[PDB]
Amino acid sequence: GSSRTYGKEALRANIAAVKAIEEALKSTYGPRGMDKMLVDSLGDITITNDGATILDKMDLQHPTGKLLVQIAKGQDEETADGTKTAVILAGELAKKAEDLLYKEIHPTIIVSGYKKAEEIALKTIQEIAQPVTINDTDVLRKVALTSLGSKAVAGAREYLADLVVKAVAQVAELRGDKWYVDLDNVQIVKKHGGSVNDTQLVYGIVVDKEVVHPGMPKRIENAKIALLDAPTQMHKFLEEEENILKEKVDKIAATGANVVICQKVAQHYLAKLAVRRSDLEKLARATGGRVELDLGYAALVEERKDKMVFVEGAKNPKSVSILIRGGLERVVDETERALRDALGTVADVIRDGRAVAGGGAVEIEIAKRLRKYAPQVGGKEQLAIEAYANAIEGLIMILAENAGLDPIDKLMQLRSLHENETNKWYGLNLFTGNPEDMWKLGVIEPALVKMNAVKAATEAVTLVLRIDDIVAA
């Protein structure tokens, strides 16, 4: 025994799976949006509004949904943002395809329409965007703040916004006639007992070591660094192992190193600087050293009051550390998850120097270009392009409907404001119900994240259409 299902009934059964997976996410479309409660088989309780999190702990019985979710998860590791937008948009394009199938259009006309709209949308995003550079640091601060905000740690402590902006403004490499960065170049340190304004940047590389040995010179300058993975006969062996302590000095003097860090007593003779205990790799990347004596170099090393050790002016100038100290664990452990995602959004601007307004300002310029382009295509395909435009505007209703407003009128006001000339940045504010200019409010996101949202939605829906039949064996 096995089941075969084919034709319109298999296509309806696939669309009813996509409109279920989108229904699970619709309400959490941020900001100012609801959370979901997830309970596991053990009885743990979790509260979340992070879509990449929900899609790993919800569980899905239907195989076509299992393909849609896999595309939306694959979407999160390539770019890091737009996990929910690429599911909502893929929900709307299917819901509006259902209106075209009742007019008896064949699916290969619809799919040819969508893949003919997406290529004029991606051109329009590159046309309406505006360029930005590292020197435009106000715009970098506005992007950081927008990605950072809506948690307890926020731009009420705007020191966090300058902290991240300065930290990646330091690490700028130049490649492809453009700037380049990666998160491997900038490191955190996390500890408890502190304050969120006590967190600081350094322009140096730092470890929260509570001890280094007391006789040693706690300031070292214009210096060389080494990073290391390095009865009667019983008394002779015991001495031979105590002489192996002096063999550390013997081989440091063989190379002239000043501070010497080893993975895992005779420290009075060394004092006549040792660090007791993947971080040696970070020190090597800062110092230019290597983990037989190969040395690295730095302008200053210090230990200072909890208690800490600092390296400053290491040979590679494009490396930075930041330290978070907070009074409770719950603050620190989510502040990392906010702060490095903010920095990893600034990096999505800096890797490609365009920026576009949030708030639904992009969708309504796209929904104008399509409705001016559709009369040129003329055939049955014209109904598929106009059915695409109605599905992109249908996104910002899910943004207005979510902040308590009346959705239809607060769509019509925006569309009428865009029929006037210029005005291209008007969109929804969400902390007051009226439309406002999104650039002067400073609400911005990088173009690469919108392009990935549009492309992963069209790729996901044109794989749910264009399945005729289901066989199992």
Q: For the chain, what is the radius of gyration of the CA atoms?
A: 29
Tell me how crowded residue 293 is: count the other CB atoms within 10 A of its CB.
Answer: 12
User: d(Cα 290, Cα 311) in Å, to the nearest integer?
Assistant: 16
Point out which span in 58-66, 136-144, 348-356, 419-427 binds a second copy (CB under 8 A).
Answer: 58-66
Point out which span in 51-59, 143-151, 200-208, 285-293 binds a second copy (CB under 8 A).
Answer: 51-59
Q: Is 81 in the site for Mg ion (CB under 5 A)?
A: yes
DSSP 17: H
Q: Is 22 in the site for Mg ion (CB under 5 A)?
A: no
Contacts of 144 (CB under 8 A, 6+ apart): 161, 164, 165, 342, 343, 345, 346
Task: Specify burial of residue 199 (Cβ count, 10 A radius: 0-12, 13-18, 19+).
Answer: buried
**Residue 407 interacts with which of a second copy, Mg ion, ligand ATP, none, CB < 5 to 8 Å by class:** none
Minimum CB distance to Mg ion, residue 392 (Å): 18
DSSP three-state, residue 295: coil
Q: Which residues, numbered 141-180, are part of the site for a second copy (CB under 8 A)?
A: none
**Residue 39 interacts with which of ligand ATP, a second copy, Mg ion, none, CB < 5 to 8 Å by class:** a second copy
DSSP letters, 402-440, are GGT--TTHHHHHHHHHHHSSS-TTEEE-SSSSSEEETTT
Contacts of 140 (CB under 8 A, 6+ apart): 132, 134, 165, 169, 346, 349
User: d(Cα 392, Cα 362) in Å, to the nearest integer?
Assistant: 10
User: d(Cα 206, Cα 22) in Å, to the nearest integer?
Assistant: 45
Minimum CB distance to a second copy, residue 6 (Å): 8
User: d(Cα 181, Cα 351) in Å, to the nearest integer?
Assistant: 7
Q: Is 365 in the site for Mg ion (CB under 5 A)?
A: no
Q: Which of 151, 178, 415, 466 binds a second copy (CB under 8 A)?
A: 466
- Where on the chain is the footprint of ligand ATP (CB under 6 A)? 29-31, 50-52, 81-85, 146, 358-359, 428, 430, 443, 445
Minimum CB distance to Mg ion, residue 168 (Å): 17
Q: Is 13 in the site for a second copy (CB under 8 A)?
A: no
Q: At what angle do helices 159-170 and 329-350 cross, to 10 degrees?
A: 50
3-state SS of 111-136 is: HHHHHHHHHHHHHHHHHHCEECCCCC
Minimum CB distance to a second copy, residue 412 (Å): 20
> Which residue, among 296, 301, 286, 304, has the nearest Cα to 187 in the 3D structure?
286
**Residue 169 interacts with which of a second copy, ligand ATP, Mg ion, none, CB < 5 to 8 Å by class:** none
Q: Decide if 143 contacts 355 (C-beta within 8 A).
A: yes
> Which residue, among 396, 363, 399, has the nearest Cα to 29 in the 3D structure?
399
Nearer to ligand ATP, 30 or 313 (CB): 30
Minimum CB distance to Mg ion, residue 196 (Å): 22
**Residue 279 interacts with which of a second copy, Mg ion, ligand ATP, none, CB < 5 to 8 Å by class:** none
**Residue 32 interacts with which of Mg ion, ligand ATP, a second copy, none, CB < 5 to 8 Å by class:** a second copy
Pattern of binders to a second copy over 76-115, x per CB under 8 A? -----------------------------xxxxx------
Q: Is 380 in the site for a second copy (CB under 8 A)?
A: yes
**Residue 29 interacts with which of a second copy, Mg ion, ligand ATP, none, CB < 5 to 8 Å by class:** ligand ATP
Point out which span in 77-85, 123-131, 199-207, 211-219 binds Mg ion (CB under 5 A).
Answer: 77-85
Report angle CA 19, 21, 22 to the nearest 5 degrees.
65
Minimum CB distance to a second copy, residue 69 (Å): 12
Point out which span in 212-220, 291-299, 340-348, 398-406 binds a second copy (CB under 8 A).
Answer: 398-406
The four Cα atoms 73, 74, 79, 81 give a dihedral, to 10 degrees, of -10
Nearer to ligand ATP, 324 or 342 (CB): 342
Task: Specify burial of residue 242 (Cβ count, 10 A radius: 0-12, 13-18, 19+).
Answer: exposed
Nearer to ligand ATP, 51 or 344 (CB): 51
The residue behind tokens 């941020």 is: 30
**Residue 313 interacts with which of a second copy, Mg ion, ligand ATP, none, CB < 5 to 8 Å by class:** none
Residues at the contact surface with Mg ion, assessed by CB under 5 A: 81
Residues at the contact surface with a second copy, assessed by CB under 8 A: 2, 4, 6, 24, 27-28, 32-41, 45, 47, 57-59, 63-64, 66-67, 105-109, 380, 402-404, 463, 466-473
